[PDB]
């Protein structure tokens, strides 16, 4: 099933002199109180907890299940200066407090190097964005209007995705950097999807198992009435908010045990039609700055988590 796990980052010295207050109150270990109202979650990780425990509690079971042929998915989300870059990648090479994605990649490459020699663990990776409802590709400048198609087993996928093999964590990091070089950023203004496909082939039993695992770096829900944007930024905000509310509706349909789940309302929910439905664990990680100066927007972020469980 789905499990939301919120994070509140530490305060930074840039606003300690500003005179901001720590307005994030706690109750138990899975409920926050903001503006004298409680918002429930499953886990509320604090400024003091490092990346290690957050990783072990959020992403470990997903990787444990996807290596057994199942499918997993992760949703990153947050506004600017909320802790996304710190939580997802953070440190690049430091094994102390680096992000989540490098830890997933290294755990994959450390599990592969502990198995039997009769198992060819092919590791494909894709990295593509969703911009103005168009599925661009960040590994190719020509494939800017890709589309989605299905297969015989009703498993959607992008047709024409610039797949790329890998054989070490450094290649994965280089691919992620090359893709992020072309990412539309002013501040993320586009959803990004990093797919990891682990095809384990058993020779003695002759069975294959392809485990798919999605790292979704979402964009920021932006009340454009306040920001005063005009032009392309406005349309970007429109499409981003559409995709986010569609994803929220889908996750609510999932967690409410609804007989039907409208996956086809948005492309980001169309591509993920399989990795969320049944035998597929999923964990939503939201990063937030608990400073009062960023209180208002933070509420929206917390509400995006509240459209997961209830």
């Amino acid at each position: 099933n789905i499990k939301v796990m919120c994070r509140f980052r530490p305060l930074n010295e840039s606003e300690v002199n500003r005179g901001d207050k720590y307005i994030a109150k706690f109750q138990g270990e899975d409920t926050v109180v903001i503006a004298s109202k409680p918002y429930a979650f499953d886990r509320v990780f604090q400024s003091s907890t490092s990346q290690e425990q957050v990783y072990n509690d959020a992403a470990k079971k997903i990787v444990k299940d996807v290596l057994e042929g199942y499918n997993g998915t992760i949703f990153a989300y947050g506004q600017t200066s909320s802790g996304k870059t710190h939580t997802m990648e953070g440190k690049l090479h430091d094994p102390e407090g680096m992000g989540i994605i490098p830890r997933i990649v290294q755990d994959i490459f450390n599990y592969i190097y502990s198995m039997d020699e009769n198992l060819e663990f092919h590791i494909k990776v894709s990295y593509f964005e969703i911009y103005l409802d168009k599925i661009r590709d960040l590994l190719d400048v020509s494939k800017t209007n890709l589309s989605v198609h299905e297969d015989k087993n009703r498993v959607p996928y992008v047709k024409g995705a610039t797949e790329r093999f890998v054989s070490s964590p450094d290649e994965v990091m280089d691919t992620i950097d090359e893709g992020k070089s072309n990412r539309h950023v002013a501040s993320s203004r586009s959803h990004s999807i990093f797919l990891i496909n682990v095809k384990q082939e058993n020779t003695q039993t002759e069975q294959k198992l392809s485990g798919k695992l999605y790292l979704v770096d979402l964009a920021g829900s932006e009340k454009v009435s306040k920001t005063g944007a005009e032009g392309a930024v406005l349309d970007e905000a429109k499409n981003i908010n559409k995709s986010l509310s569609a994803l929220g509706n889908v996750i609510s349909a999932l967690a409410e045990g609804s007989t039907y789940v409208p996956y086809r309302d948005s492309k980001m929910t169309r591509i993920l039609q399989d990795s969320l439905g049944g035998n597929a664990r999923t964990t939503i990680v939201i990063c937030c700055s608990p400073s009062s100066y960023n209180e208002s927007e933070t509420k929206s972020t917390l509400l995006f988590g509240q459209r997961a469980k209830t």
Partner: protein, 426 residues
């Protein structure tokens, strides 16, 4: 302001939109020469929304005509109100799709759509600020369905921020005019679901029965069916063309009937429809029109509304009415049939009123119901599709022209998920 360009493809679409230009020109006093000879200034108050002013006070349509056979172009030129159209908007090929979606979506359509696309660019740049388009096609054949589908896809790629219309005539199972109706219809619906913004699922057998029984006419020709469709079409956009006590343009009807992006397939209807003899034994009043349009036997879609629930229903009246009477009767209908009208959407009724009725009647109305009975349509066709797809019948035509079996499978999957959408809200 809020201009509209009327794309119009296929033989059936050509005839329907021709009758539409006929009825809309009769209401604006536009002679066959494109010249104005009307009476009221309210006609010319909003002539620019469809028509365009030319040298000599000659108003010409903003209508693109499309086909892969010049016979329909000959018909539209030679028929009445043919000279009104602009000759440059005639865009015709020579092959003919032959009820092949592939030919009219990959081979001939892809080669011909550049002219149509440049022409709609020209017509969209000549205006001030348009609101939405109108596609008038048919899901049975390959010319209409395939060409309009490729075209509307290119449009939504170009203009994704404009409301979109599709006045489709879905093929009924009993009125079997061609053999590959399920293929073309499903392959078109795979694109109309994700590209369009609101679609009106007119049906042939519906209008046939309406002309047999509700009008008691003995020989229903395509002219009468097209006249029904034309009255339906003009009834929807009267709010733009004329003032009123409560206006409702296209976008308002959309956002007051489209709760979710995919639940936008509507069954339309029209009232008052009367025979010749019963025209005297009929008092034109709001309760009469009201109980006449909600009748299942006054619908232009072959799907019994009694077998399903209403989600949203827009009644666009036309005439100097009393709004209290209107809202009272619509409320009373929502109360008498509380089981049909859905419960988790209070005020299932949208209402719209104008002051200028059609030329001939004292009052009139128009009906757009977003019922859940539509699933039955997409059930029946689907069965036929399976019956033709299980044995791979008639498939080598589509295969040899550029398609693949997986596109058929994807269309079927999307259509079944749409049926599930319409099921769960029942």
């Amino acid at each position: 302001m809020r201009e509209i360009v009327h794309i119009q493809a296929g033989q059936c679409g050509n005839q329907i939109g021709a009758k539409f230009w006929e009825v809309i020109s009769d209401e604006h006093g536009i002679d066959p020469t494109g010249s104005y000879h009307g009476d009221s200034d309210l006609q010319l108050e909003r002539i620019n929304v469809y028509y365009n002013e030319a040298a000599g006070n000659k108003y010409v349509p903003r209508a693109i005509l499309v086909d892969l056979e010049p016979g329909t172009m000959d018909s539209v030129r030679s028929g009445p109100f043919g000279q009104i159209f602009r000759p440059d908007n005639f865009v015709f090929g020579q092959s003919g799709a032959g009820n092949n979606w592939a030919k009219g979506h990959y081979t001939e359509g892809a080669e011909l759509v550049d002219s149509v696309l440049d022409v709609v660019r020209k017509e969209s740049e000549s205006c001030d600020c348009l609101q939405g388009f109108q596609l008038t096609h048919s899901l049975g054949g390959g010319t209409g369905s395939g060409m309009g589908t490729l075209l509307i896809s290119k449009i939504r790629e170009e203009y994704p921020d404009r409301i979109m219309n599709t006045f489709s005539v879905v093929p009924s199972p009993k009125v079997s005019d061609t053999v590959v109706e399920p293929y073309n219809a499903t392959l078109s619906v795979h694109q109309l679901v994700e590209n369009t913004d609101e679609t009106y699922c007119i049906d042939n057998e519906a209008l046939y029965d309406i002309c047999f029984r509700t009008l008691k006419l003995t020989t229903p020709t395509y002219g009468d069916l097209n006249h029904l469709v034309s009255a339906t079409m003009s009834g929807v956009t009267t709010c733009l063309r004329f003032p009123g006590q409560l206006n409702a343009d296209l976008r308002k009807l959309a956002v007051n009937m489209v709760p979710f992006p995919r639940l936008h397939f509507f069954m339309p209807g029209f009232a008052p429809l009367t025979s010749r003899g019963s025209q005297q034994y009929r008092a034109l009043t709001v309760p009469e029109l009201t109980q006449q349009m909600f009748d299942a036997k006054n619908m232009m879609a072959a799907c019994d509304p009694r077998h399903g629930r209403y989600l949203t229903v827009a009644a666009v009246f036309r005439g100097r009415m009393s709004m209290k009477e209107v809202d009272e009767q619509m409320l009373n209908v929502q109360n008498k049939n509380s089981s049909y009208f859905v419960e988790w959407i209070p005020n299932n009724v949208k209402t719209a009123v104008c002051d200028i009725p059609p030329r001939g009647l004292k009052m009139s109305a128009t009906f757009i119901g977003n019922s859940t009975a539509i699933q039955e349509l997409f059930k029946r066709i689907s069965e036929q599709f399976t019956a033709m797809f299980r044995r791979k019948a008639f498939l080598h035509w589509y295969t040899g022209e550029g398609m693949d079996e997986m596109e058929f499978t994807e269309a079927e999957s999307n259509m079944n998920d749409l049926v599930s959408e319409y099921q769960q809200y029942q």
